[PDB]
Amino acid sequence: DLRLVDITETQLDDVLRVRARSFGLLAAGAREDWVRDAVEFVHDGRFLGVVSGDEVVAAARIWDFQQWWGGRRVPMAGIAGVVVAPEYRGRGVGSLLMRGVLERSRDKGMPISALYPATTVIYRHLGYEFGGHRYRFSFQAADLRSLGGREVAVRRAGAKDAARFLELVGTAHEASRASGLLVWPESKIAEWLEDEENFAYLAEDGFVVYNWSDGDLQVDELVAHSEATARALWATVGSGASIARTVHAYLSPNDPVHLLVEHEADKQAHVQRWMLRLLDAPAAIAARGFAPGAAAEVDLLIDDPGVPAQSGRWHLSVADGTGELTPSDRSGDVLQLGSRGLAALYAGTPLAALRTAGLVTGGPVASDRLLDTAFGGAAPYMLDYF
Amino acid sequence: DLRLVDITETQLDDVLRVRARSFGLLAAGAREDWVRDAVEFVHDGRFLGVVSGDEVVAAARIWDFQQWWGGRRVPMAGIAGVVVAPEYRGRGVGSLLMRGVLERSRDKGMPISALYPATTVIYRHLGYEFGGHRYRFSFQAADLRSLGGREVAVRRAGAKDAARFLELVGTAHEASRASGLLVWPESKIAEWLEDEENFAYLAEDGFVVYNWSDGDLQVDELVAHSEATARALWATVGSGASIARTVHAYLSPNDPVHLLVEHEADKQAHVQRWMLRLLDAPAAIAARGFAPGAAAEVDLLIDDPGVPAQSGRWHLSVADGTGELTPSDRSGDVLQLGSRGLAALYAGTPLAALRTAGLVTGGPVASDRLLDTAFGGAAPYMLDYF
Amino acid sequence: DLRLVDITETQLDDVLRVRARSFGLLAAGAREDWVRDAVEFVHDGRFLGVVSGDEVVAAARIWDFQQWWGGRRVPMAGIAGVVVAPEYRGRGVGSLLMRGVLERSRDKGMPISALYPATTVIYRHLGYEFGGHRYRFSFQAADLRSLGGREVAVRRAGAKDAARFLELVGTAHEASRASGLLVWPESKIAEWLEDEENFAYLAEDGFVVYNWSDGDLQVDELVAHSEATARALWATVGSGASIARTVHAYLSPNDPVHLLVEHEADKQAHVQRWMLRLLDAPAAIAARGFAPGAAAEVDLLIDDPGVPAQSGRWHLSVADGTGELTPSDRSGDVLQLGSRGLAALYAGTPLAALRTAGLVTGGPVASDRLLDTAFGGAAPYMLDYF
Amino acid sequence: SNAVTDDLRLVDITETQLDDVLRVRARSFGLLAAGAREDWVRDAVEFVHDGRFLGVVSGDEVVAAARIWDFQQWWGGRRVPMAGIAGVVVAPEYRGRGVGSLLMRGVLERSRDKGMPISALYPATTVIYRHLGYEFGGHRYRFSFQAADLRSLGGREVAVRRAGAKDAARFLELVGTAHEASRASGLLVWPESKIAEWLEDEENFAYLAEDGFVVYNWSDGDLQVDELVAHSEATARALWATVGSGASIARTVHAYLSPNDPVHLLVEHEADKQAHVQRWMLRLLDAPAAIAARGFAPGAAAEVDLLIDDPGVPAQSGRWHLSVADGTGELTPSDRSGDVLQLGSRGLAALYAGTPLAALRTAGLVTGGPVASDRLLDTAFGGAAPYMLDYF
Numbered sequence A, B, C: 001d002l003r004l005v006d007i008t009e010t011q012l013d014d015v016l017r018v019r020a021r022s023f024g025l026l027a028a029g030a031r032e033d034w035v036r037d038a039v040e041f042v043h044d045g046r047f048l049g050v051v052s053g054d055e056v057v058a059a060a061r062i063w064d065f066q067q068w069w070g071g072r073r074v075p076m077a078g079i080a081g082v083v084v085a086p087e088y089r090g091r092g093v094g095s096l097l098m099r100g101v102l103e104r105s106r107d108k109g110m111p112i113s114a115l116y117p118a119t120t121v122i123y124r125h126l127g128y129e130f131g132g133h134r135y136r137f138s139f140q141a142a143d144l145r146s147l148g149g150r151e152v153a154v155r156r157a158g159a160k161d162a163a164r165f166l167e168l169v170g171t172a173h174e175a176s177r178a179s180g181l182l183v184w185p186e187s188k189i190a191e192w193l194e195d196e197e198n199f200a201y202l203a204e205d206g207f208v209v210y211n212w213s214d215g216d217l218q219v220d221e222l223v224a225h226s227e228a229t230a231r232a233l234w235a236t237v238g239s240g241a242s243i244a245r246t247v248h249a250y251l252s253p254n255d256p257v258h259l260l261v262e263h264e265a266d267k268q269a270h271v272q273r274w275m276l277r278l279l280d281a282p283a284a285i286a287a288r289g290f291a292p293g294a295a296a297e298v299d300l301l302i303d304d305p306g307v308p309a310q311s312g313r314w315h316l317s318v319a320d321g322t323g324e325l326t327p328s329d330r331s332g333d334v335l336q337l338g339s340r341g342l343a344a345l346y347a348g349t350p351l352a353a354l355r356t357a358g359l360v361t362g363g364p365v366a367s368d369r370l371l372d373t374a375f376g377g378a379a380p381y382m383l384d385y386f
Numbered sequence D: 001s002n003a004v005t006d007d008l009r010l011v012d013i014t015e016t017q018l019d020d021v022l023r024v025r026a027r028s029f030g031l032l033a034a035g036a037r038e039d040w041v042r043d044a045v046e047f048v049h050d051g052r053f054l055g056v057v058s059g060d061e062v063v064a065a066a067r068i069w070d071f072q073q074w075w076g077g078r079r080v081p082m083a084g085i086a087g088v089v090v091a092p093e094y095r096g097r098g099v100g101s102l103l104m105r106g107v108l109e110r111s112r113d114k115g116m117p118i119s120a121l122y123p124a125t126t127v128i129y130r131h132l133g134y135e136f137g138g139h140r141y142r143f144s145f146q147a148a149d150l151r152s153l154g155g156r157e158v159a160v161r162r163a164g165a166k167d168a169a170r171f172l173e174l175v176g177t178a179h180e181a182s183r184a185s186g187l188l189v190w191p192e193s194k195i196a197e198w199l200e201d202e203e204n205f206a207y208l209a210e211d212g213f214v215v216y217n218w219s220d221g222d223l224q225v226d227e228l229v230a231h232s233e234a235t236a237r238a239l240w241a242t243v244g245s246g247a248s249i250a251r252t253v254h255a256y257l258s259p260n261d262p263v264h265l266l267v268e269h270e271a272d273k274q275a276h277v278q279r280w281m282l283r284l285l286d287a288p289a290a291i292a293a294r295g296f297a298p299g300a301a302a303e304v305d306l307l308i309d310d311p312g313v314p315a316q317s318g319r320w321h322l323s324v325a326d327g328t329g330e331l332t333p334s335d336r337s338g339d340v341l342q343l344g345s346r347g348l349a350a351l352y353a354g355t356p357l358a359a360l361r362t363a364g365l366v367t368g369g370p371v372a373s374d375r376l377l378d379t380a381f382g383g384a385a386p387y388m389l390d391y392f
């Protein structure tokens, strides 16, 4: 009796009721902000639901992201707000919903999907697997304050600097061949920079955005193309040390700040994980950046009953930072993988780990080494939660 | 009045006084145990001190480790127990000690050195830089118990099994081309396993060692070549769930366990950093494993006033998993590095980060891509603190 | 110059001032809800105060409850919001107030009165004694989620279902001969179920009402006539285990959930006590339910200077589930009790403890067995605080 | 484990196997301090010599172990011999393979052979014990009071003296008198010898009046009452005031006692809202003998059939008639076949412990039979809520 639907504006009240019984209550002001954001999802076909009769019983949204992979931007479906009414849980409703979400993401031409799961079981069944991390580290403000770079011009930034921020990030991630980071629309970055609770500063070759977190400061993002600039931006955040003793920062464990500060980040850190799924393997491969110098001619046997279109035997050809995935008619021993193994592989997870987890099977070890290096590079991470 | 010396047995009581005023007091039992372990260092010339008159004023010891790098074992001088008497601190005594340590380390043919620093400043001045991590993750015991694997034969292990453990771990790290991990003497492993407080279990293709940690269980090390065995070993630890709610484990963030367990490790994790220094760059390179398929022909200009023998221009040649560093007399623009950047590079830290931290300067961007992939591979980590 | 009055609607602002200086400030929002509730009390003659000249100096409210005793509903005056202006405390004003409250509740035809005391001294002087408990137990949501009962129809409930909730509760408490539980007017039950912060669910023979409690779930009440329904309703609460780790529940220590769940409730529990007083002993006895099979013919000598109409020598006759308290002409040795011992005995507190507390004196031990079993039965408890 | 080579069998643990049991225990509960091991071995030998220490071996390696305390347990104011199961441990690589169940079946059999009609334990996990027929039967409560409040309870006129080992038999008399008068249920009866050990321990502070006693000790800066027994108001006040006299140093007194304890009626400030509530489980091993030894509620009368389904103890299984009158009960075979209350071991144990029939039916532990039987059984097994002061 259940039906998958496109959520409309007039159903948002019912979606909010299912939400209140899933995540918790919304404050009266936060509810108005939620509805405002829900509208753009509705009118772009990125708000799916399940109805029982005329009752909305489950819902999920799809962010129109791009995600960095090996220094290139790949269209990505970010799944958010997955909720099911308590009395409709444990009956296949969430799965029905998510299958509809996957189909909608494919139709919109998004070759990959990511999410932060509250429970892993349902998403693993649908073929998602952990693909990367989000790290929060804690530093002493007084240490950051003293980093110097006082000669660098740093000015307060605002909504009007959105395009410049995008440019700066793009240059950085392309040079480092970064993986995992989200690309937001210029419009959402403008909102971000316009929020008066966010403190943003811009230098010629870097920027920082930070805010208050319970008496301490929290860095949402710092980007810097040179040492003097990194120092000046960290020093700007740390300049509040007379009040904030601690600054937490979302960044990679490979961030240069660890090499710059005197006092090591606190041993206690936050490490969260996000999941990835491939929806259109050839398009995802064609869009991914590959490791400089890496060459590979490898066959892959994909078994994905969730997305039958990418099932079957493929040939993976990688050269000069580019890869292509084409149908193969060969017969030798071949690496066999399901949706989970495929996602984890694309995300750069070591074949050794994937074999031990049982996500990948068969194939010569010679293939393993070439795949490892091909998908290798910086560890995927994200700065944002969604 | 200040002299570097080799610490003797009769001086151990004075080293313990300095230690007491540096790290804190030792229980009457750990006292006797400390002396036992110290004697081996004394006799192998791996216990250095500084005297003022006839008084021991500073001391440090050197572990004769090996360390895995790209799947090969590299001899490594592990520095421990660096202490200076309070009234002698801040006067260069610690630095004099450490230069004697680096010198002794070189004489014993160890091409690299690592340590966990309480303060970064003295070691950075000496040329060390952060090279890798030690991660502790926390899981729910009941969730590990549910992994199953009970069909897999598993027996209690003892000191007699030390050689077998070494075989299993060697096979694992060579397959994954691991970096960072310590190699302990078989004698040290036998002791580890003899200890009644350590619970060691052995399968055909894996092992686990764990113990109690304040009411929780703590996994020191788990090695497993197959899924069934990984399940069996983790489930053996988790079988104590009726008493211990939580299992903490030292392992990599790429460990297959994250792919197997239902509930994600606690967001709250321990992340520690250890530092590295190259003492003999040509030998360290020649001993390192390199990424499969990686090729590179690049010049490097090393400026290391701490070890002038490795200073000057070099040619790095990497092919087929092996690298060689030879003297170069070429001119023109070249990647320039101090000891800190050199260690970080060797450890796999990306050049983009090194450049932003100011640890590396000059040279074409072409070289950076070559270097990154050459030194690429799994992120370096350690299971042990010392 | 101190005068007891009936609180009028225009004195409510004065009451709130007293309350602010007694319990703490009210949010401007919550203040409006307090007025809304206070109006009903004023009109029905259930809001008393003490004035000093013009200004209100003290106030207290009387809820028009019924309370289950031995499976029957007894009219009960629930005392709430007892407050005295700080500079008027310790001068007998609170006791003047409460004698007014006791006077008023009897006049309204209420045989018993109950309250949660912030201090025991004043209420003990007025003749109240502890009669029962309110328990909170903490369970693992994952455990509740898996209880099953999937076959049982469970639907979302609302204000409209208020009458059916009353019916189900009525059937349960009569079958168990429950004691201590409050009976709310169908009006307040409606508001309860209207409140969007409360999540209510109905089955053919059971229901549950729960809500968020700081990231955990809290069950206000769960009633189930059958195993299948008990499982289904607990599973409905537990279905949120992906977000809520813990489910707190107000229930009896005899609740069947303890017999169903795999993991025992946390050792750490909440145990609060509420107090009871008899206002009209013969009517209280006449309305109480008595243990099946129990028969007793025993005299009581009551000394209650707070309610002199109850005082004197009485004869308790108990047979076939009902009891009767009659004036007695007999002369010899007899159990003597004051108001505190009387209330405690009514509540089912065993004679042995009453004697050791000194709340009851004299009489033969043959009488004690007669009394114990007469007033014996399930331990009295409440789900609600007031 | 290694099923190919394992040869698992139940044994009686010997004195020379204690070191091996200690290995299994360390990997189960945690390491023992040096001084605590000494006290464990000495205690273990007693169990070994009385045939109350069972284990499982594989070949000649000890793989599991459990011991049986020779307790008595109060039920409705009478003492019932009871097998208290403790230290249940299985080596990690042998868990989840039926070893603990094989051990515990041997434990139940040894307990029956020794004439104990009931058994109790504090379970770390309920699953294995419910499969074997145990169910929750009662509680252990810890409440916390303000010491300064206890200190002013009075009773200065009551003679209170320091007690020691030689007062063990007097303590048992006082406890006995109290529990018979209140028809108490759940409480442990320890051997006089074990009580003497308790009172000779310098860390325990014991005081004795003419009609009561108290034993208490330090608990991390606060005081903890292990047990207080008092027959009269004056004595209760005096003994609580003895404990509370420590208030200048200890702000808080924790106490193990029933929620029905008179102290709640005596003290000004009520116990902290935050309390400890632990549960222990019960199983009947010989139901007729358990019923015969139980005290039953004064005035209670009941004639009711029970259909017992206990394949764990076949001798208990079948249809029985329960006769209760004048405080005494008897269970005899019935040849009737009409509608009857049906229960397994879990429901039987819970019913014996006084759990309400309504709860047992909702929990599914009890099925069928007329509603009229429910009321009779409820009052028969009714009385004070079972509790225990001790953990084991």
Ligand SMILES: CC(C)(COP(=O)(O)OP(=O)(O)OC[C@H]1O[C@@H](n2cnc3c(N)ncnc32)[C@H](OP(=O)(O)O)[C@@H]1OP(=O)(O)O)[C@@H](O)C(=O)NCCC(=O)NCCS
Pocket: B239, B240, B241, B242, B243, D028, D029, D087, D088, D089, D090, D091, D094, D095, D096, D097, D098, D099, D100, D101, D102, D122, D123, D124, D125, D127, D128, D131
């Ligand atoms: C003694 C004990 C707890 C059980 O002995 P054992 O030889 O492991 O027991 P075994 O006879 O093999 O199985 C009987 C049943 O019990 C279940 N089950 C067992 N354990 C747990 C659990 N943790 N959590 C949940 N359930 C558990 C088993 O489930 P499965 O593993 O088969 O799915 C069996 O149920 P079934 O599958 O038929 O539904 C042992 O594991 C131990 O020493 N633990 C640590 C020390 C300790 O706590 N000591 C003090 C204790 S006071």
